[PDB]
């Protein structure tokens, strides 16, 4: 959260509320959600050798 040096103090109270990601990104529950279609490589001609 922070870095302090001698004689420095942080005192605070935090209130946590339910929210959706649309209002703010802080409420989003997933680091990333993504979908990829499955690859289907097809060799049209047989490939042999080097």
């Amino acid at each position: 959260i922070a870095q302090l040096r001698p004689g420095q103090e942080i005192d605070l109270l935090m209130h946590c509320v339910k929210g959706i990601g649309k209002d703010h990104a802080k409420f989003s529950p997933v680091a990333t959600a993504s979908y990829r279609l499955l690859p289907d490589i097809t060799l049209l001609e047989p490939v042999e050798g080097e």
Partner: protein, 138 residues
Amino acid sequence: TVAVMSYSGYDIEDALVLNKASLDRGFGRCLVYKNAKCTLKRYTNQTFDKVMGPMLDAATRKPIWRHEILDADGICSPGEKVENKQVLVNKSMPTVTQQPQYKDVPITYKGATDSYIEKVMISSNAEDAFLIKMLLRQ
């Protein structure tokens, strides 16, 4: 992370589309610091500028709203938020042009948006002038 593409038509002439989630996480978050300074001088006549304390409301034992953030020395206090038409230094000056008679000359925060006070600097020059500088944060 820039994607070079044409998106939404709001980017026709140099305009660029930003991401809301990136801005929320802190992309482009910036601080603006502004000054406010006041000088209290000792005149040729043996008279001086002074800072009066906060003017209390007698009916409610709290300062009037225009004086809400003043500390007991009449100078605004670090940490508190200033709003428009609020005084920072409750300065009064002699209208000498038999006892002194003072006109109020308060330093006031003009600004469309609210600012926070980070520190108040008090120092004095050799001529017995008192210098006050406020650092303000947005």
